[PDB]
A paper describes a structure:
HT7 was engineered from a bacterial dehalogenase (DhaA from Rhodococcus sp.), an enzyme that can hydrolyze halogenated alkanes. HT7 reacts specifically with chloroalkane-PEG (CA) molecules resulting in covalent bonding of the alkane chain to the reactive aspartate and release of a chloride ion. In addition to the conventional α/β-hydrolase topology, HT7 features an extra capping domain made of six α-helices (Hlx4–9) that partially cover the catalytic site and form an entry channel for the CA substrate. The alkane-fluorophore is positioned by the Hlx6–turn–Hlx7–turn–Hlx8 motif of the HT7 capping domain from which T172Hlx8 and, to a lesser extent, T148Hlx6 form hydrogen bonds with the oxygen and the nitrogen of the amide bond linking PEG-alkane and fluorophore. CA-TMR and CA-CPY have similar conformations in both structures with only minor differences in their torsion angles.
To guide the selection of an SLP–substrate pair and provide guidelines for the design of substrates, we report a systematic and comparative study of the labeling kinetics and substrate specificities of HaloTag7, SNAP-tag, and CLIP-tag. We complement these kinetic studies by reporting crystal structures of HT7 and SNAP covalently labeled with rhodamine-based fluorophores, providing a detailed understanding of their substrate preferences.
Author numbering: 3 to 295
The structure:
């Protein structure tokens, strides 16, 4: 079925004194497509979408600082930490104009960068992105208790850091189809050492849920407003029931956002890339052929 291997040559770039691993494939002459993963994934999540796009466009898929095959310094791994490291990563590869393909926390990165560099973003494909969740009722009920547990300095760290629940439990619960043992091992590899699991816990404590953290809420609201006011070509993927984006919200945004094409990928939760990579890749490639890049 959905291939579990990772047939990509490892690329490394030094960013603020640390090395960041990244996938780099495709032609070098045009505009490149930058793939940003989230929590608790790596560039491995893009492994079955990239081969659809590589024939025609450059694919760049970094592992976030502290995750995947990137270096893992002793940082707090707040959202701002990733913002600094991703700005410096984009400048280290001398990328001028890019097309964004962003998911989960990568979306919060991508969108934020796009707000600060409007002339440099030729297109944004996004899925299960970070939006402001006004109350806990807008969070899916089946996960509502668990993320509330995750957002505590005592119980949450025992779950995510000591017992590694975000990798062993939450991650498969974010995919409709079952993850194979090879896939689980690939996702487990960067966090075999518990001390390296700080990012797995800080991200859910950065989620803009119920107005906290206030700075993250403001930051996210700002680029959501910028998105509602930008003419950038937009491609939005959504699934049922979803996690961050329920179908109702996706439908709303499909009309409220300028130049927005929506694509229903079928059953999905949060890692839509794992439930229907074929459709996402084919749609991204066809969408890319319609841009002026
Ligand atoms: Cl999270």
């Amino acid at each position: 079925g959905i291939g579990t291997g990772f047939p990509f040559d490892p690329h490394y770039v030094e960013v603020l004194g640390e090395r960041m691993h990244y996938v780099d494939v495709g032609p070098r002459d045009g505009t490149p497509v930058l793939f940003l993963h989230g929590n608790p994934t790596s560039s491995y999540v893009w492994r079955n979408i990239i081969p659809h796009v590589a024939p025609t466009h450059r694919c760049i898929a970094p592992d976030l600082i502290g995750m995947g095959k990137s270096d893992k310094p002793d940082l707090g791994y707040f959202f701002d930490d990733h913002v600094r490291f991703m700005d410096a990563f984009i400048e280290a590869l001398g990328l001028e104009e890019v097309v964004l393909v962003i998911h989960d926390w990568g979306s919060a990165l991508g969108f934020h960068w796009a707000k600060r560099n409007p002339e440099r973003v030729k297109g944004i494909a996004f899925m299960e992105f970070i939006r402001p969740i006004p109350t806990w009722d807008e969070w899916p009920e089946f996960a509502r208790e668990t993320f509330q547990a995750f957002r505590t300095t005592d119980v949450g760290r025992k779950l995510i850091i000591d017992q590694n629940v975000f990798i062993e439990g939450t991650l498969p619960m974010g995919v409709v189809r079952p993850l194979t043992e090879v896939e689980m091992d690939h996702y487990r590899e960067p966090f075999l050492n518990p001390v390296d699991r700080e990012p797995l816990w800080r991200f859910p404590n950065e989620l803009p849920i119920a107005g906290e953290p206030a700075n993250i809420v403001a930051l996210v609201e700002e680029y959501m407003d910028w998105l509602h006011q930008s003419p950038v070509p937009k491609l939005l993927f959504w699934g049922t029931p979803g996690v961050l984006i329920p179908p109702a919200e996706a439908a709303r945004l499909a009309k409220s956002l300028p130049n927005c094409k929506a694509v229903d990928i079928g059953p999905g939760l949060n890692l839509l890339q794992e439930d229907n990579p074929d459709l996402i890749g084919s749609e991204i490639a066809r969408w890319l052929s319609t841009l002026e890049i």
